[PDB]
Amino acid sequence: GSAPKYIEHFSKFSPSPLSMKQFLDFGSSNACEKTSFTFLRQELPVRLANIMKEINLLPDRVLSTPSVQLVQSWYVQSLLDIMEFLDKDPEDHRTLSQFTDALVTIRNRHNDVVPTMAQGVLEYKDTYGDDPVSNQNIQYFLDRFYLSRISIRMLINQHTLIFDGPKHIGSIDPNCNVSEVVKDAYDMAKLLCDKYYMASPDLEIQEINAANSKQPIHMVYVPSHLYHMLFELFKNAMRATVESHESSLILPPIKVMVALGEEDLSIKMSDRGGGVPLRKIERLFSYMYSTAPGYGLPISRLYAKYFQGDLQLFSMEGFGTDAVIYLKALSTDSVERLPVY
Amino acid sequence: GSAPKYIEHFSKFSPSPLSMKQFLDFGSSNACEKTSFTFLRQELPVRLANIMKEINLLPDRVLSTPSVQLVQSWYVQSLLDIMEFLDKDPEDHRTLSQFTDALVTIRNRHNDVVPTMAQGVLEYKDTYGDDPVSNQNIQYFLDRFYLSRISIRMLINQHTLIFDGPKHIGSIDPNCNVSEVVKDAYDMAKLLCDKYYMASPDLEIQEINAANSKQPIHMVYVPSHLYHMLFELFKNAMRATVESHESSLILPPIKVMVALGEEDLSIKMSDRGGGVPLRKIERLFSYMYSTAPGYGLPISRLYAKYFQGDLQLFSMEGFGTDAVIYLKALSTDSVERLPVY
Ligand SMILES: N#Cc1c[nH]c2ncccc12
Ligand SMILES: N#Cc1c[nH]c2ncccc12
Ligand SMILES: [Cl-]
Ligand SMILES: [Cl-]
């Protein structure tokens, strides 16, 4: 087979990070399908080969596991699927239609990679232990492997959603109202909270538009990514609030502040769920320490970092916890953050 | 001279970190002066030699500067001063009295090491530049050099303050009321704020004693260290609040929360001084980036880390900033954190 050959070749190239503007240009109209095809048939084999080369450089005890071999098999097949289109003609509509169908198949093939890689982490802990050095190496690899995955699934979604044969550009909303996404994520977390706990904290939202007070806060962003982060934070904050007030009657509300500055758009979620000692904060972001026979926070932080943001937690044991999503306010500063190969 | 010989010998030993309990035992009574002398005449040459060996391993362009040579000369003389007492007899009261006088001299000799090392940083920036690699190496060294200094000045203060010929044990207050220290630091910052700005924010304090509600929060700590941290944070928060509301009439108060948990004692200072973009947070803790022709925060964080605590900043650009001091609530968990040699 030529799979090792392809990996070596395309690993020589560096991934090309795209900005929000570039995403909006690719999706401005259906006339750009050919340009998207020409870009992706080269870029997707590059990004796939770079992360596949890093997988092959893992230690033999990790590389020989069934989880890694299964994931690697799905990365080899996806690579080969894209390679078939390198010599095809963009002017042929059939070539473009087949490319879209191939991307949907590739996306579905990798839909279970996060629980599979979690199974591998649990196997490692039981087979070799949970030492700190192992934690760092696993954290280093999975952060890069999951950020690569996010970037590859972003490109695929933009092509398939737009070139399917407007206000929203695929998964990007150029006028995303942050408060509405906050409400949506709270409402979903509330439904689950009421069902499992028979009680739910209320929600309070306050907006601070520094430059234009009393004007609703909008941004260019991927609302599905923002929902995923806010949903995970709401679930954790509601659980802590309800469980810490089981023997009390008052249930403190969850308070969200949306602040718009000259370059940051910040979203703070404040709860009074008893808080967490500082010693345990790092474990909440660790894949290995959160694994038990709990990746919402570490993956949520990767979504924030994907467009040059961040997600941070600061708690006060005995009182409550604050969780801040830092996003770039300006589309010019919103650029893909890809793993440094 | 035997100075290089002494450094090599005592650098072989590891510093011995002490706990709060051990500090209270050394200072329980004046009868323990002999034990303190026997411990310090060995421990102080160990800690001095370890940081002196690291200084000698700096690159020649840093080591040859007048600032480092001056500091190193003060570390060689202080070492030699302590070496004189190694063969002396602890039972002789004159030996003990002379040791105390020697420690006061050593302490005063090093009183200007923080502005001197700041002069060296400014010289480096102008002579070789402010590249990121230089920033990391300088940050790594100064954090260790300033934490060593804090630990050596703690030992000296405990001996000189107690064995000078109770409620407080030297610089340690076994019943430190945190809120009172907060008020003291605010009052000092307010005086300076009113003098320079003709306006000052008010103060609001709220205590959360999770285990014993409505009971004042006390701890075993060094109130002078806590004051230094709170004073620096108050000065920065007041400056930002006043300057960000110059064209407004309302001046938001600075809100402090003191929370006591099972293992953390947390102090949050919240202001509405307009906040800071996330990109600038790391620069606030950098010695090199805060140097201009501003070490309060980086040194304040070292005071917090000295007894296994921390100091963290999280801001919301366009609104305000939160600054949290994390301390250990229990004296059993309060142990010296020394540089890993
Ligand atoms: N995210 C988040 C959290 C928000 N509050 C929490 N309390 C305990 C543990 C995690 C959390
Ligand atoms: N410490 C601290 C600060 C608290 N608020 C601030 N605003 C701007 C810059 C630094 C700070
Ligand atoms: Cl994947
Ligand atoms: Cl010093």
Domains of chain A: 2-162 (1.20.140.20), 173-333 (3.30.565.10)
Report B:204-243 residues touching A (Cβ under 8 A).
208-211
Helix axes B132-162 and B113-128, enclosed angle (nearest 10):
170
Task: Answer yes or no: B228 catalytic.
Answer: yes
The binding site of B for ATP consists of 232-239, 271, 290-291, 294-297
Work out the number of other CB atoms within 10 angstroms of the CB of residue B9: 13
Long-range (24+ apart) CB contacts under 8 A made by B71-78 are: B71/B113, B71/B116, B71/B117, B74/B109, B74/B110, B74/B113, B75/B48, B75/B51, B76/B3, B76/B52, B77/B109, B78/B48, B78/B106, B78/B109, B78/B110
H or E element in which residue B157 lies: helix B132-162
Cβ of B318 within 8 Å of Cβ of A268? The answer is no
Residue among A210, A317, A201 at smallest CA distance from A254: A201
Distance CA A233, CA A231 (A): 5
For ligand 2, atom 6: residue with the closest CA: B237
Q: Using CA atoms, how far apart are residues B166 and B164, in angstroms rounded to an integer? A: 13
Contacts 24+ apart (CB under 8 A), B82-91: B82/B40, B82/B41, B82/B44, B82/B45, B82/B48, B82/B106, B83/B6, B83/B45, B85/B37, B85/B41, B86/B41, B86/B42, B86/B45, B90/B34, B90/B37, B90/B38, B91/B34
Rounded to whole angstroms, how far apart are CA atoms B211 and B260?
A: 8
To test ligand 1's pocket by mutation, which of A231, A235, A236 has the most ligand atoms within 8 angstroms of CB? A236
Expressed in percent and rounded to 5, the helix, strand and coil fractions of chain B are 55, 15, 30
Q: Would you list the DSSP string of B160-207?
A: HHHS----SBTTBEEEEEHHHHHHHHHHHHHHHHHHHHS----EEEEE
A145 in contact with B, Cβ within 8 Å: no
CA A332, distance to chain mean position in Å, is 20
Q: Do A259 and B209 touch (CB under 8 A)?
A: no
In this structure, are strands B173-177 and B203-209 parallel, antiparallel, or unpaired?
A: unpaired
CA distance B273 to A302: 29
**Two structure tokens written together for B112:** 């200007």
Closest to B243 (Cα-Cα) out of B204, B284, B267, B271: B271
Verify whether ligand 1 is closer than 6 Å to residue A233 (CB atom).
yes
Give dist(CA B282, CA B298) in Å, integer.
Answer: 10
Rounded CA separation A324/B314 (Å): 8
* 8 Å CB contact between A177 and A149: no
The enclosing H or E element of A4 equals helix A3-11
Partner residue facing A278 (CB), from B274, B277, B326:
B326
Q: Are the beta carbons of B261 and A277 separated by less than 8 Å?
A: yes
Q: What is the resolution of this structure in A?
A: 2.0
Closest CA to B325 of B306, B304, B308: B304
Contacts of B264 in chain A (CB under 8 A): 275, 277-278, 316-318
B137 carries an active-site annotation:
no
Residue numbers of A annotated as active site: 228, 232, 235-236
Please check whether residue B205 is in contact with residue B183, taking contact to mean a CB–CB distance below 8 angstroms. Answer: yes
DSSP secondary structure letters along A162-199: HS----SBTTBEEEEEHHHHHHHHHHHHHHHHHHHHS-
Residue A312: helix, strand or coil by DSSP? Answer: strand
Of B219, B203, B310, nearest to B253 (Cα)? B203
**Phi, psi values for residue A80, rounded to 5°:** -60, -35
| Dihedral sign of CA atoms A37, A42, A46, A52 in order | positive
Q: Which two tokens stand for residue B229?
A: 């941290």
Q: How far is B247 from chain A (nearest CA, A)?
A: 14
Q: Which residues contact A222 (CB under 8 A, 6 or more apart)?
A: A154, A171, A172, A173, A307
> Do B262 and A277 count as a contact with CB atoms less than 8 A apart?
yes
Read off φ and ψ for residue A200, nearest 5 degrees: -145, 140
Q: Which of B88, B228, B245, B305 is catalytic?
A: B228
Phi, psi of B276 (to 5 degrees): -145, 140
Burial of A152 from C-beta contacts in 10 A (0-12 / 13-18 / 19+): buried
What is the DSSP code string of A23-56?
Answer: HHHHTS-GGGHHHHHHHHHHHHHHHHHHHHHHHH
Q: How far from chain centre, in Å, is Cα B207?
A: 25
3-state helix, strand, coil in chain A (%, to 5): 55, 15, 30
Tell me the residue length of chain A: 341
Instruction: Dump strand ranges (E) for A76-120.
Output: none
d(CA B20, CA A336): 48
Hey, what are B119's tokens? 């002069």
Specify the 3-state DSSP secondary structure of B231: helix
Question: Which value, in Å, is the radius of gyration of the alpha carbons in chain B?
Answer: 22
For residue A15, give the 3-state DSSP assignment: coil
Contact A279, B221 (CB under 8 A): no
Distance CA B313, CA B323 (A): 5
Residue B242 phi/psi, 5-degree rounding, is -65, -45
Q: What is the CB neighbour count within 10 angstroms for residue B49?
A: 23
Q: Decide: helix, strand or coil at residue A326.
A: strand
Indicate which residue's Cα is closest to atom 10 of ligand 2. Answer: B236
Cα separation of B179 and B172, whole Å?
16
Instruction: Using alpha carbons, select from B61, B71, B73 the residue that is nearest to residue B137.
Output: B61
Element housing A316 (H / E): strand A310-316
- Show the tokens assigned to B18: 């002490």
**Nearest neighbour of B266 by CB, restricted to A209, A266, A316:** A316
**Are residues B264 and B334 in contact, defined by beta-carbon separation less than 8 angstroms?**
no
**B contacts of A278 (beta carbons < 8 Å):** 264, 310, 326
Give the nearest ligand 1 atom to A276 CA: 8
CB B313 within 8 A of CB B307: no
